[PDB]
Structure 1
Amino acid sequence: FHSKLQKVLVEDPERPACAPAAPRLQMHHVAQVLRELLGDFTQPLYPRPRHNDRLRLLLPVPHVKLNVQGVSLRSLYKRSSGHVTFTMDPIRDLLIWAIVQNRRELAGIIWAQSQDCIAAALACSKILKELSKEEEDTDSSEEMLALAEEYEHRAIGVFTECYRKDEERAQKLLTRVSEAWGKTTCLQLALEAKDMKFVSHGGIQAFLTKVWWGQLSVDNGLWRVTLCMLAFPLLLTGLISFREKRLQDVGTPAARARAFFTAPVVVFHLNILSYFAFLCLFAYVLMVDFQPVPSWCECAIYLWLFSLVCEEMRQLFYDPDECGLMKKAALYFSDFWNKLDVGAILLFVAGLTCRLIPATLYPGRVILSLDFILFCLRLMHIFTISKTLGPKIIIVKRMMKDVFFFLFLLAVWVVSFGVAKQAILIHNERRVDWLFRGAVYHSYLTIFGQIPGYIDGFPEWLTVLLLCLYLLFTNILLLNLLIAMFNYTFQQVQEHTDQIWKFQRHDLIEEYHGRPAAPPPFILLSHLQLFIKRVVLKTPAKRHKQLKNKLEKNEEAALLSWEIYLKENYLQNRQFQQKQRPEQKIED
């Protein structure tokens, strides 16, 4: 950490950047290096701007009259500023300094007297993890990673003690912002530290089942909510288990559905069955509607492709940095499923240009049938949801390159039979691109069953022999030892792929919450609703429909006094649980 602060003082040196002088390390610099170790979050703990621009104080910059890259409200310019009294996180200032110097025994004492306990442990899980990946090449990058999971387990035990007593206040402790840490609400601060173990603990997964399944309940079954999705008057019946019906707040049956349709469960459901039936609509125009013209049931697919790729336009304008247009899109380039989205768009431009050209309907018939299944990978992509599906569709995520493995094993091993079959017998069926049928295509059919035994059957004894010998090396070795390859690796990283799916579970809900409840036939209106607004508006200051719950002042001390009392209740337990471990008693 010192070598990074031996650089920002010189990447921003005395003459060109901190333009009077900077060989004197001042607190603006240590804020600027900390935002690198943290993420794309707010202005750091210490004052950046013109009040306390602590970058340019060795040369006589003016006093109180200046207020631009100098001192404004502090008392006297004595190669210092004055008492910037305590800046509201005075214990947390010792905590960050104790962490970056890797002082493991020292930093544990400072965290005991912390105020915002959950965030301050969790933030130190990110600063350590981003520092251990940086550099030592050994032996303390291991220790910093060891301290990171130590503070993680230290962070869980404070929330676990807090989750047990009155969990409805414990979820409020999770999603609150914290002025002491650059707002960085605690759930959001966990995820950039990638935090496998913290997100998987209990109520954190139960909090996500309360924002998803928005206003209704967690009790209602999945097979029973979908009935009222299609049957709109059956929603009003005595079937569904709301919270508005619990407090009998049904004064408007549209508002009974307005809270219902804005729940993330059915904006997911209505998007699914729009996407479940668009491929049915595409199945209509390949069977019967094979015409070289834009027909009646053809023009909507052009308006369907305009509807969904402009949802990326909603995501590009969603939450960027306000200068990097090409540095946010690399994250979409870091998603191969995003490259499977637009890769299923570029193949449609290679498919639509064969559909308008009239002399190429036969290549237009063969190149767009793979778009039906390339989108079916994207259909299963949004189907990483169910608790019996999600955590074990991650085992095929343990297998996606290994899809290419056993294919290239066994199907090339198919060729070891498929060439071996036609040789000894005198086969005579040949055509232009059906001798390949009678030699090569009839070899995969003799695997899963189409054996022309009147045609495949003097060399009958050897037609026994390799048909036994080849099926020996496949059906025994490539099936049932491949069974071993899975189920052991199924046993292996299972706890990961549980908690990985627990960690992946938030990324679906952030997409589906902060998005209006319009169906994809009606999402095109809301594509324009924010554009007509900017014929009236001019600045992006519409709304912040993020989790991001700001709190009132008299409620924050009504929570932070409660949490410190729960911290000291937890710390006395681990201090007692350490004494109860018998290996301590032999040391005793």
Structure 2
Amino acid sequence: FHSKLQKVLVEDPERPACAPAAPRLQMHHVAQVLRELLGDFTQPLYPRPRHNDRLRLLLPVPHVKLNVQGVSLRSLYKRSSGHVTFTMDPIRDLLIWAIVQNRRELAGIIWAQSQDCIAAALACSKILKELSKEEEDTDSSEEMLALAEEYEHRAIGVFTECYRKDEERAQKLLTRVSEAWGKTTCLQLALEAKDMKFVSHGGIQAFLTKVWWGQLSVDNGLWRVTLCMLAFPLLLTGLISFREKRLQDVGTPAARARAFFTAPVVVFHLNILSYFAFLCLFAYVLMVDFQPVPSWCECAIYLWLFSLVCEEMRQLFYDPDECGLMKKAALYFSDFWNKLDVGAILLFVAGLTCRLIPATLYPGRVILSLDFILFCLRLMHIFTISKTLGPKIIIVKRMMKDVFFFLFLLAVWVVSFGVAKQAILIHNERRVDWLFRGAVYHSYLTIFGQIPGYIDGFPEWLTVLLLCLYLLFTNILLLNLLIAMFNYTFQQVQEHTDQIWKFQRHDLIEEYHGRPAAPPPFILLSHLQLFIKRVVLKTPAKRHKQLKNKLEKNEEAALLSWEIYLKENYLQNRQFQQKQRPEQKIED
């Protein structure tokens, strides 16, 4: 941490203030050393501009007579800029100071009187895990990871004792903004701490279950919601009733339709429907509409493909921040899935251009046919819903991400199959090689095992016996890799794949939840509402779809005192358990 401080002080110093490198310790240096340990948080207590001007307070500045520089309140200068008695609060920043310094006692000693009970521990855990994953590499990394997961134990303990009492305010606790921590709703900071045990503490199950269903209560089954959504007037019959019908809030079928469509689960099964429907429509338009001219089916398949391009369009602008467009967007798109997302459009564009080119009129269709395999990947990429198959689908996601290089090993190794079998005959590098058979590219295999012997009518069998034996050897060198790489994370997964399940669920929903409730058939209304509205503004400033809430002062204080009291209750109980383990007995 101190080396990082020296680096950040030498990255942005000035020349005259101090000679080697030491101008001042400002909010700048701590701000960068935090931003390299955080994401989109807030910059604390004094931005640069005129309202809170800290710009030139490193050289003498003009006095009150201009009323534009400095403080403009006191006409006297005493070689100092003053002293604010309370920055915001001491404990929240003193935990930050102590955690990066890697001790046992001091962190807990300071926390024992923390006003912000839950968010400070999560922030400390996140910072400390980042310091673990940066660089110590021996003799400390595992111990202070154990300390981190101890902070997760302790956050679970305080959440336990706040779910002991006052369940209502307990669930509203999980949107803690605090107006001083870089709000993160107390959950974005939590999920950035990666939450080994935190995301499965019962109350969070109730939370993520009641937010997963918008205007949809209990007594709904997985097999029975399909009938509710598929059969459209049927919801108004004596079928499963909602609290809207129970409270007689369904005064109009239009109101029922609006309440149902805006439910989060509806858009998920809607994109389940529309994606496969678009795949079938691609098959339909490739299969009959092989007309370069714009026909009815050609425009029909253009419509939804352009809509999907618009959705990936919107995700691509939402990926980066307001300033760095290329850098962090490219960092996120360096992932194989996002690289394939770019490729799915680039390959389609290239294939269309080739098809319009007279040279590749026929090969254009073959080239465009290959792009469907990429969409096949999205098919099982998005199917993370099933209760028992879903965790296994996360497992297949991670295993294929791991064997992404075994993929290339297998593919490159096989190149010694056709070349090895074809070594008998002379190559054709500048010849008539292509036209009917040559060696590689796509379609006319008749050597599937069906050697054309129809023209026919001690030594010679065993090297072609050893071709199949060498296939058995392929089962030796390569099928071993599958079970091998699986058998490294094989313990206690069945019960602790629920943690990984919940984590990628929340990570996925955090950015996939901001999708419109209008169905693709009714997407023109949202288009006329927002897409033509975009052009008048440099940046789309639509209201951001989140579950955060604005906290008032009275409710803030009334809650915070309550977390402090239950923190005292947790601390005394904690002492009671620290009596229990036999270690205290032996040193007693």
Q: TM-score range by the shorter chain?
A: 0.7 to 0.9
TM-aligned CA deviation for residue 334 of structure 1:
3.3
Call closer, same or farther: CA 1:552–1:88 in 2, change over 3 Å. Answer: same
Call closer, same or farther: CA 1:151–1:68 in 2, change over 3 Å. Answer: farther
Contact kept? 1:347, 1:371, Cα under 8 Å? yes
Q: Secondary structure at the match of 1:499?
A: helix
Tell me the residue number matched to 2:401.
Answer: 401
Contact kept? 2:176, 2:183, Cα under 8 Å? no
TM-aligned CA deviation for residue 412 of structure 1:
8.9
Call closer, same or farther: CA 1:58–1:489 in 2, change over 3 Å. Answer: closer
Contact kept? 2:261, 2:517, Cα under 8 Å? yes
**Residues 1:504 and 2:504 are matched in the alignment:** yes
TM-aligned CA deviation for residue 348 of structure 1:
0.9
335-344 vs 219-228, greater mean Cα deviation: 219-228
Contact kept? 1:18, 1:55, Cα under 8 Å? no
TM-aligned CA deviation for residue 274 of structure 1:
0.9
TM-aligned CA deviation for residue 401 of structure 1:
5.4
Contact kept? 1:22, 1:58, Cα under 8 Å? no
Q: Secondary structure at the match of 2:326?
A: coil
Tell me the residue number matched to 2:448.
Answer: 448
TM-aligned CA deviation for residue 583 of structure 1:
2.8
Q: Distance in 2 between matches of 1:362 and 1:75?
A: 84
Contact kept? 1:31, 1:46, Cα under 8 Å? no
Q: Distance in 2 between matches of 1:522 and 1:230?
A: 17
445-454 vs 110-119, greater mean Cα deviation: 445-454
* CA offsets 1:377-427 (integer angstroms, 9 cap, x no match): 012221223332332122223432565677778889989999999999999
* CA offsets 1:228-269 (integer angstroms, 9 cap, x no match): 323221122232343323433223332222222112111111
TM-aligned CA deviation for residue 283 of structure 1:
1.0
Q: Secondary structure at the match of 1:180?
A: coil
* CA offsets 1:200-220 (integer angstroms, 9 cap, x no match): 433334423322222213542
Q: Distance in 1 between matches of 2:74 and 2:322?
A: 31
TM-aligned CA deviation for residue 553 of structure 1:
1.6
107-116 vs 294-303, greater mean Cα deviation: 294-303
Contact kept? 1:24, 1:57, Cα under 8 Å? no
Contact kept? 1:29, 1:55, Cα under 8 Å? no
Call closer, same or farther: CA 1:444–1:359 in 2, change over 3 Å. Answer: closer
* CA offsets 1:336-389 (integer angstroms, 9 cap, x no match): 212111211111113223444566454234223322221110122212233323
* CA offsets 1:76-132 (integer angstroms, 9 cap, x no match): 643334452323323213222222322331111111101111101011122223333
* CA offsets 1:273-321 (integer angstroms, 9 cap, x no match): 1111011001112333333433221112222232122223323444753
Contact kept? 2:348, 2:371, Cα under 8 Å? yes
Q: Secondary structure at the match of 1:484?
A: helix
* RMSD over equivalenced CA pairs, Å: 4.9
482-491 vs 304-313, greater mean Cα deviation: 482-491
Tell me the residue number matched to 1:289.
Answer: 289
1:235-246 equivalence runs, <5 A: 235-246=235-246
1:86-125 equivalence runs, <5 A: 86-125=86-125
Q: Secondary structure at the match of 1:41?
A: coil
Q: Distance in 2 between matches of 1:393 and 1:575?
A: 43
536-545 vs 498-507, greater mean Cα deviation: 536-545
Call closer, same or farther: CA 1:476–1:333 in 2, change over 3 Å. Answer: closer
Contact kept? 1:52, 1:72, Cα under 8 Å? no
Q: Distance in 1 between matches of 2:359 and 2:71?
A: 76
Q: TM-score, normalised by structure 1?
A: 0.82
Contact kept? 1:200, 1:503, Cα under 8 Å? no
Contact kept? 2:199, 2:502, Cα under 8 Å? yes
TM-aligned CA deviation for residue 451 of structure 1:
11
Q: Distance in 2 between matches of 1:319 and 1:438?
A: 45
Q: Distance in 2 between matches of 1:444 and 1:291?
A: 25
Call closer, same or farther: CA 1:112–1:81 in 2, change over 3 Å. Answer: same
Contact kept? 1:63, 1:70, Cα under 8 Å? yes
Q: Secondary structure at the match of 2:439?
A: helix
Contact kept? 2:5, 2:33, Cα under 8 Å? yes
402-411 vs 342-351, greater mean Cα deviation: 402-411
Structure 1: runs of 5 or more not aligned: none
Call closer, same or farther: CA 1:458–1:221 in 2, change over 3 Å. Answer: farther
Tell me the residue number matched to 2:195.
Answer: 195
Structure 2: runs of 5 or more not aligned: none
328-337 vs 343-352, greater mean Cα deviation: 328-337
Call closer, same or farther: CA 1:501–1:64 in 2, change over 3 Å. Answer: farther
For this pair of structures, how many residues does the alignment match?
A: 588
Q: Distance in 2 between matches of 1:459 and 1:399?
A: 46
TM-aligned CA deviation for residue 194 of structure 1:
3.1
Contact kept? 2:99, 2:107, Cα under 8 Å? yes
Contact kept? 2:319, 2:329, Cα under 8 Å? no
* CA offsets 1:522-546 (integer angstroms, 9 cap, x no match): 3354244224445777875542322
Call closer, same or farther: CA 1:143–1:363 in 2, change over 3 Å. Answer: same
